[PDB]
């Protein structure tokens, strides 16, 4: 199993380079691979790697070619005009630029299998296409290829695509090699990854990461591990977690912290394609958004999420109601009947449940699960499952019986169509988690539920105070535990914003003073202060240095242990655009004890401007090493979704930084 051509230093400076002499007649049979090893942290727009063409006038869509965009997408073109085949295959978000300064050797190999009319495309470890056609066209048997070409595509006798770059390593083979040797070629990758496509959760997407360094040292992340592609609900979306207790070398396989089994877990290849790539699971209860703390005082983890049941919809569900009655000064959670048309329930007391308009208890009760129960008896439903085996996106019952959850689309009883809070913990460090408890409206029986901003919660360091940030229309309204999350309180903080998603992420300047950074609409990150453990808040200032664009992006934040430069410092991680999700940042910031002004004086950039960064997270690791987990494509972009893998973990160090 041995290159039929292997080459190697090659530099591309907007010059290609020939090696048809070398490679052209080792050409043969219909199936080939493409190994590469190649850097480029200042690409043209779109450029070629790697071309095998028909140099003859007449022939210009005659070729085969490795692309690349200035984006970070990868692809390949397979062309031949006699045959009437012009193939692209591509997915953005592929590449990297740039790590610690330095240029990434990307790990590109490109399998063309003739037996299985297939062609697949991995770069740095991970598979980013795979596409089977009906008619196959083998890369070597186009109508007069002449010309093997590095760095550009040769048609008709000129440099097309020209390429800025290098090949440190190429070599051929005349065969497609398995998956599995595949996974024996050394990679040099600047990440690795903590969720993937085919671990436990069985999720084949991944948005909204967390990161947390708890006191023994375990660093814990959790994760949306998003089922139905990368839409925000509605979808099936779980929340995962995994633990490293090496700093962050090695990561455990994940778990589930929140999770609904009204639908299955597949792992779902979503369509991309302009037609489909906004189909959605649509009677899914899902999560979404998770943040994470650690109590100082049981030594409990605690993590909240959004929840949302599957009636859940965009606009006219539920805003004006909180899905719970105000009853006595307390609050119970209602519910609706199959049948009726209002919502003539509530879960009293114990999980019993009430009929409101007879005041009588019935004989069904919710367990801790938020399970139906008739009679001391566990109600089910039958399960769903997604295909897209008609040409579109079905949910079908598959057989399966699962316990009827007041979430799900058949249950006997539902809760209100609105978003809600659920809060869980771990005993064990992140080894298991509770069952869910959702928390109490806060801002009254008719608002609807605030929002998670998430990442990470505060614990402060001089009490026992935890505080989660959440968001709604016109404030930021933190939560507020004394008691280890058993009862909260909110403290409301108003911001000049209606209908912003103003994720808000906190730091400890000095003991029980906080400062907020959040997401806006003005194209420039905000902040507000504390001075009183979250009692009362600042008004709002903005931050100068950093882009966002108008619709913005979450931003995590960090206060370092160590000082830097003989000060207080403090770390921001955010896309630095006014474009797009992109050219992502570690910003460290000096702080000024005169009147906790922060001069941000280091500019981190995490690979290159162009290169997509959208939500990320941050931690001190117990070594004082930086944790940064991070999605690494355009999760606005609608040319960047239902991507796999993107979601990745970095290690660095302040001296990086700085
Ligand atoms: O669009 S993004 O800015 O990439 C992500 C925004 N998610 C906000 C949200 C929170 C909870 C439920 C739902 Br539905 C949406």
């Given at each position: 199993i041995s290159p039929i051509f292997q080459g190697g230093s090659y530099q591309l400076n907007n010059k290609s380079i020939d090696i048809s002499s070398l490679l052209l007649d080792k050409l043969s049979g219909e199936s080939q691979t493409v190994v590469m090893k190649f850097k480029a942290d200042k690409p043209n727009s779109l450029q070629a790697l790697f071309g095998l063409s028909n140099?003859?006038?007449?022939?210009?869509?005659?070729?085969?070619?490795?692309?690349?965009?200035?984006?970070?997408?990868?692809?390949?073109?397979?062309?031949?005009?006699?045959?009437?085949?012009?193939?692209?295959?591509?997915?953005?978000?592929?590449?990297?630029?740039?790590?610690?300064?330095?240029?990434?050797?990307?790990?590109?190999?490109?399998?063309?299998?003739?037996?299985?009319?297939?062609?697949?495309?991995?770069?740095?470890?991970?598979?980013?296409?795979?596409?089977?056609?009906?008619?196959?066209?083998?890369?070597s048997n186009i109508n007069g290829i002449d010309k093997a070409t590095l760095g550009?595509?040769?048609?008709?006798?000129?440099?097309?695509?020209?390429?800025?770059?290098?090949?440190?390593?190429?070599?051929?083979?005349?065969?497609?090699?398995?998956?599995?040797?595949?996974?024996?070629?050394?990679?040099?990758?600047?990440?690795?990854?903590?969720?993937?496509?085919?671990?436990?959760?069985?999720?084949?997407?991944?948005?909204?990461?967390?990161?947390?360094?708890?006191?023994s040292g375990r660093v814990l992340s959790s994760i949306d591990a998003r089922y139905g592609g990368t839409h925000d609900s509605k979808s099936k979306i779980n929340i995962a977690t995994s633990y490293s207790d090496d700093n962050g070398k090695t990561w455990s396989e994940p778990i589930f912290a929140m999770k609904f089994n009204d639908y299955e877990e597949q792992l779902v290849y979503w369509p991309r394609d302009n037609k489909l790539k906004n189909s959605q699971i649509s009677g899914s209860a899902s999560f979404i958004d998770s943040s994470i703390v650690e109590d100082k005082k049981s030594g409990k983890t605690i993590l909240?999420?959004?929840?949302?049941?599957?009636?859940?919809?965009?606009?006219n569900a539920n805003k004006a109601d909180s899905g719970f009655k105000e009853i006595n000064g307390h609050y119970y959670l209602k519910l609706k009947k199959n049948g009726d048309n209002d919502f003539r329930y509530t879960v009293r007391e114990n999980g019993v449940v009430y009929n409101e308009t007879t005041n009588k208890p019935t004989n069904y009760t919710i367990n801790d699960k938020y399970e139906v129960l008739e009679g001391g008896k566990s109600l089910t439903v039958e399960q769903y499952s997604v295909d897209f085996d008609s040409g579109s996106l079905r949910e079908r019952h598959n057989g399966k019986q699962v316990p009827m959850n007041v979430f799900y689309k058949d249950s006997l009883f539902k809760v209100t169509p609105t978003n809600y809070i659920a809060m869980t913990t771990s005993q064990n460090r992140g080894e298991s988690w509770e069952q869910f408890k959702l928390l109490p409206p806060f801002l009254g029986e008719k608002h609807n539920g605030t929002y998670?901003?998430?990442?990470?919660?505060?614990?402060?360091?001089?009490?026992?105070?935890?505080?989660?940030?959440?968001?709604?229309?016109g404030e930021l309204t933190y939560l507020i535990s004394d008691d280890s999350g058993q009862t909260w309180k909110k403290s409301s903080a108003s911001i000049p914003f209606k209908n912003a998603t103003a994720e808000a992420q906190?730091?400890?300047?000095?003991?029980?003073?906080?400062?907020?950074?959040?997401?806006?609409?003005?194209?420039?990150?905000?902040?507000?202060?504390?001075?009183?453990?979250?009692?009362?808040?600042?008004?709002?200032?903005?931050?100068?240095?950093?882009?966002?664009?108008?619709?913005?992006?979450?931003?995590?934040?960090?206060?370092?242990?160590?000082?830097?430069?003989?000060k207080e410092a403090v770390i921001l991680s955010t896309p630095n655009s006014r474009s797009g999700?992109?050219?992502?940042?570690?910003?460290?910031?000096?702080?000024?004890?005169?009147?906790?002004?922060?001069?941000?004086?280091?500019?981190?950039?995490?690979?290159?401007?162009?290169?997509?960064?959208?939500?990320?997270?941050?931690?001190?690791?117990?070594?004082?090493?930086?944790?940064?987990?991070?999605?690494?494509?355009?999760?606005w972009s609608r040319n960047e979704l239902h991507l796999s893998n993107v979601v990745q973990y970095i290690d660095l160090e302040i001296n990086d930084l700085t």
């Amino acid at each position: 199993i041995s290159p039929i051509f292997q080459g190697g230093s090659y530099q591309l400076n907007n010059k290609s380079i020939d090696i048809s002499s070398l490679l052209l007649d080792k050409l043969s049979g219909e199936s080939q691979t493409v190994v590469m090893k190649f850097k480029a942290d200042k690409p043209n727009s779109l450029q070629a790697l790697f071309g095998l063409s028909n140099s003859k006038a007449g022939f210009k869509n005659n070729y085969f070619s490795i692309f690349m965009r200035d984006s970070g997408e990868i692809g390949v073109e397979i062309r031949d005009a006699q045959k009437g085949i012009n193939y692209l295959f591509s997915r953005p978000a592929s590449l990297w630029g740039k790590h610690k300064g330095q240029a990434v050797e990307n790990t590109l190999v490109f399998v063309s299998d003739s037996k299985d009319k297939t062609y697949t495309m991995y770069v740095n470890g991970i598979e980013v296409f795979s596409e089977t056609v009906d008619t196959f066209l083998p890369i070597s048997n186009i109508n007069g290829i002449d010309k093997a070409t590095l760095g550009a595509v040769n048609r008709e006798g000129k440099e097309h695509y020209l390429a800025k770059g290098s090949i440190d390593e190429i070599s051929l083979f005349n065969k497609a090699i398995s998956d599995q040797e595949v996974s024996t070629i050394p990679l040099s990758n600047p990440f690795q990854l903590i969720f993937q496509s085919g671990d436990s959760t069985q999720a084949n997407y991944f948005r909204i990461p967390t990161l947390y360094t708890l006191s023994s040292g375990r660093v814990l992340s959790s994760i949306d591990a998003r089922y139905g592609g990368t839409h925000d609900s509605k979808s099936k979306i779980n929340i995962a977690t995994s633990y490293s207790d090496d700093n962050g070398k090695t990561w455990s396989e994940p778990i589930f912290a929140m999770k609904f089994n009204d639908y299955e877990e597949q792992l779902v290849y979503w369509p991309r394609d302009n037609k489909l790539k906004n189909s959605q699971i649509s009677g899914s209860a899902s999560f979404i958004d998770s943040s994470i703390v650690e109590d100082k005082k049981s030594g409990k983890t605690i993590l909240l999420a959004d929840v949302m049941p599957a009636g859940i919809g965009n606009n006219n569900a539920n805003k004006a109601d909180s899905g719970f009655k105000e009853i006595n000064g307390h609050y119970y959670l209602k519910l609706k009947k199959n049948g009726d048309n209002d919502f003539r329930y509530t879960v009293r007391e114990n999980g019993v449940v009430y009929n409101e308009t007879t005041n009588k208890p019935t004989n069904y009760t919710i367990n801790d699960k938020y399970e139906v129960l008739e009679g001391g008896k566990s109600l089910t439903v039958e399960q769903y499952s997604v295909d897209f085996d008609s040409g579109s996106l079905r949910e079908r019952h598959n057989g399966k019986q699962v316990p009827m959850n007041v979430f799900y689309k058949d249950s006997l009883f539902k809760v209100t169509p609105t978003n809600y809070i659920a809060m869980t913990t771990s005993q064990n460090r992140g080894e298991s988690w509770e069952q869910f408890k959702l928390l109490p409206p806060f801002l009254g029986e008719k608002h609807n539920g605030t929002y998670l901003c998430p990442g990470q919660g505060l614990a402060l360091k001089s009490s026992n105070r935890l505080i989660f940030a959440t968001y709604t229309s016109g404030e930021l309204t933190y939560l507020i535990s004394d008691d280890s999350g058993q009862t909260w309180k909110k403290s409301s903080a108003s911001i000049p914003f209606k209908n912003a998603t103003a994720e808000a992420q906190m730091v400890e300047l000095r003991d029980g003073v906080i400062r907020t950074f959040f997401r806006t609409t003005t194209g420039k990150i905000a902040y507000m202060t504390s001075r009183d453990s979250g009692e009362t808040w600042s008004k709002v200032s903005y931050i100068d240095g950093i882009q966002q664009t108008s619709y913005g992006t979450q931003v995590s934040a960090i206060k370092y242990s160590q000082l830097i430069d003989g000060k207080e410092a403090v770390i921001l991680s955010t896309p630095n655009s006014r474009s797009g999700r992109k050219g992502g940042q570690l910003v460290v910031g000096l702080v000024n004890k005169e009147d906790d002004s922060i001069d941000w004086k280091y500019h981190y950039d995490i690979d290159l401007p162009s290169y997509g960064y959208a939500y990320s997270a941050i931690t001190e690791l117990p070594n004082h090493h930086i944790g940064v987990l991070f999605e690494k494509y355009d999760s606005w972009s609608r040319n960047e979704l239902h991507l796999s893998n993107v979601v990745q973990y970095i290690d660095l160090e302040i001296n990086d930084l700085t």
